[PDB]
Amino acid sequence: RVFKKSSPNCKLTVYLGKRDFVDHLDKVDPVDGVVLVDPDYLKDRKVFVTLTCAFRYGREDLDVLGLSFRKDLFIATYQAFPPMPNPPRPPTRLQDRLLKKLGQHAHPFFFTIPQNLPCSVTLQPGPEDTGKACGVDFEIRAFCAKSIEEKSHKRNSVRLIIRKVQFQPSAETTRHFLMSDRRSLHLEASLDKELYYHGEPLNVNVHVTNNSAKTVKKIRVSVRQYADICLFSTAQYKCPVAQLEQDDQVSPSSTFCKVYTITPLLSDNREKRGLALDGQLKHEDTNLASSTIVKEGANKEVLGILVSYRVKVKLVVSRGGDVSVELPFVLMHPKP
Amino acid sequence: RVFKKSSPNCKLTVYLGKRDFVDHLDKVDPVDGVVLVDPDYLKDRKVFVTLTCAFRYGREDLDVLGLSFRKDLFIATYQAFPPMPNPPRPPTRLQDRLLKKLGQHAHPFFFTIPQNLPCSVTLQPGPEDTGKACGVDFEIRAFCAKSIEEKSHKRNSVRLIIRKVQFAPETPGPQPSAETTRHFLMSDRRSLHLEASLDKELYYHGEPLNVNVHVTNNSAKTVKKIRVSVRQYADICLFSTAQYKCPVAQLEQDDQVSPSSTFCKVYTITPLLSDNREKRGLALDGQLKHEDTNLASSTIVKEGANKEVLGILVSYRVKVKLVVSRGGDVSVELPFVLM
Amino acid sequence: RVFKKSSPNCKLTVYLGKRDFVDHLDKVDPVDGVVLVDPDYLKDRKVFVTLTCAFRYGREDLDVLGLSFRKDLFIATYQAFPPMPNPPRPPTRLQDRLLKKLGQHAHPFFFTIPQNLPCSVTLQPGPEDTGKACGVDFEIRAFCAKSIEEKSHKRNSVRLIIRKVQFAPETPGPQPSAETTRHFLMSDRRSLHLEASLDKELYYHGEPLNVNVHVTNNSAKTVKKIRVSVRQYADICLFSTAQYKCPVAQLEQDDQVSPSSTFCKVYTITPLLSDNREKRGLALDGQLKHEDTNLASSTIVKEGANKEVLGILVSYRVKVKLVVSRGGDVSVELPFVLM
Amino acid sequence: RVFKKSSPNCKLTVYLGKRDFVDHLDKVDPVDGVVLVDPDYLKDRKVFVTLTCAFRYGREDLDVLGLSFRKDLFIATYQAFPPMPNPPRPPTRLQDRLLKKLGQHAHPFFFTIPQNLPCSVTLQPGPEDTGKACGVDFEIRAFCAKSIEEKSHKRNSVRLIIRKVQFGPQPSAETTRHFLMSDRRSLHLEASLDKELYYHGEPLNVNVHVTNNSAKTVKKIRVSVRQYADICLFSTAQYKCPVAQLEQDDQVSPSSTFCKVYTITPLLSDNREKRGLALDGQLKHEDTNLASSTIVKEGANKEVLGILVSYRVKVKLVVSRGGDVSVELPFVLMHPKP
Amino acid sequence: KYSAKTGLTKLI
Amino acid sequence: KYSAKTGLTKLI
């Protein structure tokens, strides 16, 4: 399926294949599309195309109203018209469909993405904060201004939102105390897999491994979303997307075991504060944010929201202390 | 050197001497340990301890659902507590150390093994995935269920991996050698008298791989090379015996043979475990959860039994691969054993 | 499985086949490598290559400021660049895989080891102060200093440690069984005839030690015990060949023999390394810098040279210890070999 | 050698062994000594002894509007006089030496130290900043107040400053560096060593094995020892400052594998009269040393409030445009113990 | 069915 | 006295 965007002046009309671009990491999903422009308005007028990897942390006019503006991580620009040497060596098969479909005035275009670019992730708005926003995003504007390609103005610029979404760890630790000297909590939150996506839930095989005194109250496992934000201060925002639990108690001098089955649902954390979501395509229903990562650390810090996930396995022990432990694991998309 | 698994439970705390027990020929090496137990929760709760001879060929809950499980080739079952009027009659002198150091409640256990059980042997996994395991193992669990020894559960169990081994006899077979003829469509003369003579029959880990190859030649059809190749045969009788060809090692020199004379070269090889690490499908001796193993010992199938031995039957055969113009790769196999 | 050391400075990258080279009997395993060098900063800069077989028995800069250093057992040097008249005549097919895999600049190299070199064997450190480090090793290096091959420094050299591990011969010696009769001052009879009869003569790291011990008895001092103990001779030769006794492993049940008959049991052991890990002064086979090694194989001395072999000369023997009332620790030793 | 402190009322005196106490690890060094009071002012007034472990981060009659004071992470109290059916069940051999030398009056005293406590370590002030301070100290007080055990002041309180200073694999960092205007590995840099715990008296060779710094000339390789001066009052706070660094022009070549050992000696008298480098605890005018590294015990309940010193040899290279790339490690300086 | 594990104990 | 190390390459 194909999708277009025509400006209300019918001048620059973009046709594209996919809004979701599959961010592999040896490569990345390049952009494929064409721009149908009309030439009698565009008599000695010069069409372009660009791709903006952008970072937002607030209001348009107000953080516009700043000592800084968007520090865009990336922007790609290329010459649509005049075609300076009609220079696409490889024409894409999507362009092979659109050039045959449209009038040949369709100018092809193609966007290469570099390796240091972070993914599309937005902090969840509050229910009470109306004008608060924060999110990384990727967009595409085919545009024109009389000035040479260095500048532009809002008119003739045709927006569009796309996505660059990024498509057997055991834990065992002991717990020693004041008034109960025994090992008292060995615990193994074993699993099977590390990188899941939307569709396959979270079983956590937690092996209780506990000695005698200090009656354990309960165990409960909370998928906890990390949102690391690096603009002027790195910042991590802890908030539980989902937590599930039962009342399966353990005895003094025994080795119990429970698999606890949790599933963070997008539908449940609808209408809530503080849960990074994947960027939406301007209104459409999205998912819980995919875990981003910094590949090995570029020479320049990744300025963005940096999503990680974890299972925080929490316990309560008499008379209700909230012991716990955490791990690494990652949520990213499946490729077609 | 002694080691324990202290169950976090501090009800069953099992002290053992060695993880590898030497499965001799005339006997086995028995298990010889103790279980320190604590009294204030074990009130009319009863200590037992078992030896599971387990066989594995897959995923631990996928192969569960279906109609089958692991065919546990043996299970030994001991009652530590409550004791008879002095159960331990031949006390081990390891469990003299484990009783005088430990308390009055420390509880003995020994575990004899019979004469029908194979080693702890696994395959080698691949570097690539769909989720698979296999291998025999020997393990020891100490536990306490309310019901009689014929039932058990979680919530008391102390598990430790031990190991069992085949160890081939005193005597090698005949000194195995090789000398075949080969007949064709295009060159008439016998063209390949090929005497792959050897020295020994049952090697181990830490010896050479020399093969004295004596070509006897009178022919045309220029020979190019003699590659020598240590085939592993990964026999696996699960739903059927299968062999999975893969050379643990291969060497070759460019030693070319003239027409009409007898020439001979010893071709001389090391299969090391470190060379075939992060490689697929090369049976390795079953390792103790992370520890470094060796390349799997040859397993042998007893002369005749009512039941066919199910599982991995390691064999090893040194193929002598040849190249003759314009490149035909002629060769042969022999029987030889690494136990 | 081919491996490289891309020299730190992207000049002399050394590509090789194997890091364990076979110590054969008829021959050795020679080296077959190439060196990719780049032609821009190497303009009239002349590449060579070496194999620096070397003994190690101490600290670097401390044993520097003495009178001696190490007694490098051997050093081979060969001229890669510029090729004296292009001297690869019999290229290896690994040297035929690399030259076409890499760029045209690749320069081969090849070292044939003599017959007077011991292997790569390293003393085991202990848990404590465990670095008066000892051990032979074979190491191989590319280099280019302005002055000719008889002078060099460090700013070009590419060092890659390999090994040469001894390997056992083709025939084992006759079945050994030999020890004491033990006459006394207060109990009279032949009083412990014993036979630790054995089965083979040269073992490796695949098989155990069954010892068929045959008591012959008419007692008047009660026996009570036979332990059997495999003993290593960590026979170091710096000033002197140096026997350092310690048991790699030993086993025993408590089989008792009665007065006036003949008893017999097969006691049996395995010397492991993971059991002898975290212990002091137990000669191990050479290590590849952190890779897992095993127990030292039996080293042996050739049948008459002029100069005493200097190094650690590892031997092994099942010492058959007996405990007799009221506690005399009687025993004796034999020969046997783990080469 | 022995030392005492006497009050201007010569009422309480304190005789001890050593102002330097060894912060062992399985144990610590317990305090041992005696208190020597007089008869007849101290009629029916009760002498006690205390160990004050403190965190200091500023001025004396100034920083007491911190909502607080020196937040005493720990304070120990034991009942000197009247001895209270006295449990000096083990009296000390030096207290044995003090009881017969002095009068049989001598009131012994002894202090166990718990495990969640730091060493004695301070931030070195600036050469220009006068009215500022920071640091840990372990001191002892022997006193008597006409009160209950709770009320306490000076003029009978005799205060002695003592110390609780703490008496790997061959560690090697070999890192690559990927750029935007170069392709090659362009710098592997292996800082190989032979020791990870040094003292005062054994120098700092850093065997820096360079691995291709080319296609961008290298100026050269600085090596600089940085103390980490961690401070945890309200927030943990490192304050970077190099104690010492040394320096030759040895000049790595394009396509040549260099390796140089650089020999550093961090001395105190060279860093005497400086700013921002923790020194070891000191006694009132006498000479001290450069601060020992402190360690954070494996798994306490509450985080350690103190100055938490470490050190590290930073190896800061300098490459053609004079862009100074570097890398660090862990490297810990504890004392040698008698 | 018939049981499972914990998953790791490398010495004493 | 003759010479010294770098101290590590483990594989390819």
Curated annotation (Swiss-Prot), chains B, C:
Changing residue 47 to A: Inhibits internalization of EDNRA and EDNRB. The keyword Nucleus applies. It is found in: Cytoplasm; Nucleus; Cell membrane; Membrane, Clathrin-coated pit. The modification Hydroxyproline is found at residues 169, 174. The phosphorylation does not regulate internalization and recycling of ADRB2, interaction with clathrin or AP2B1. Predominantly localized in neuronal tissues and in the spleen. One of its GO terms (biological process) is detection of temperature stimulus involved in sensory perception of pain. The modification Phosphotyrosine is found at residue 41. Residues 234-339 are annotated as: Interaction with TRAF6. Homooligomer; the self-association is mediated by InsP6-binding. Heterooligomer with ARRB1; the association is mediated by InsP6-binding. Interacts with ADRB2 and CHRM2. Interacts with PDE4A. Interacts with PDE4D. Interacts with MAPK10, MAPK1 and MAPK3. Interacts with DRD2. Interacts with FSHR. Interacts with CLTC. Interacts with HTR2C. Interacts with CCR5. Interacts with CXCR4. Interacts with SRC. Interacts with DUSP16; the interaction is interrupted by stimulation of AGTR1 and activation of MAPK10. Interacts with CHUK; the interaction is enhanced stimulation of ADRB2. Interacts with RELA. Belongs to the arrestin family. Functions in regulating agonist-mediated G-protein coupled receptor (GPCR) signaling by mediating both receptor desensitization and resensitization processes. During homologous desensitization, beta-arrestins bind to the GPRK-phosphorylated receptor and sterically preclude its coupling to the cognate G-protein; the binding appears to require additional receptor determinants exposed only in the active receptor conformation. This is Beta-arrestin-2. The chain holds residues 8 to 346 of 410 of the full protein.
From Swiss-Prot, chains E, F:
Expressed in monocytes, basophils, B-cells, umbilical vein endothelial cells (HUVEC) and B-lymphoblastoid cells. Lower expression detected in CD4+ T-lymphocytes and natural killer cells. In the brain, detected in endothelial cells and capillaries, and in mature neurons of the frontal cortex and hippocampus. Expressed in tubular formation in the kidney. Highly expressed in astroglial tumor endothelial, microglial and glioma cells. Expressed at low levels in normal CD34+ progenitor cells, but at very high levels in several myeloid malignant cell lines. Induction: Up-regulated during cell differentiation in glioma cells. It is found in: Cell membrane; Early endosome; Recycling endosome. The Ser/Thr residues in the C-terminal cytoplasmic tail may be phosphorylated. Atypical chemokine receptor that controls chemokine levels and localization via high-affinity chemokine binding that is uncoupled from classic ligand-driven signal transduction cascades, resulting instead in chemokine sequestration, degradation, or transcytosis. Also known as interceptor (internalizing receptor) or chemokine-scavenging receptor or chemokine decoy receptor. Acts as a receptor for chemokines CXCL11 and CXCL12/SDF1. Homodimer. Can form heterodimers with CXCR4; heterodimerization may regulate CXCR4 signaling activity. Interacts with ARRB1 and ARRB2. The C-terminal cytoplasmic tail, plays a key role in: correct trafficking to the cell membrane, recruitment of beta-arrestin, ubiquitination, and in chemokine scavenging and signaling functions. The Ser/Thr residues and the Lys residues in the C-terminal cytoplasmic tail are essential for beta-arrestin recruitment and ubiquitination respectively. It is linked to Oculomotor-abducens synkinesis: An autosomal recessive disorder characterized by ptosis and elevation of the eyelid on ipsilateral abduction. OCABSN features are consistent with abnormal innervation of the levator palpebrae superioris muscle, which raises the eyelid, and the lateral rectus muscle, which controls lateral eye movement. Belongs to the G-protein coupled receptor 1 family. Atypical chemokine receptor subfamily. This is Atypical chemokine receptor 3.
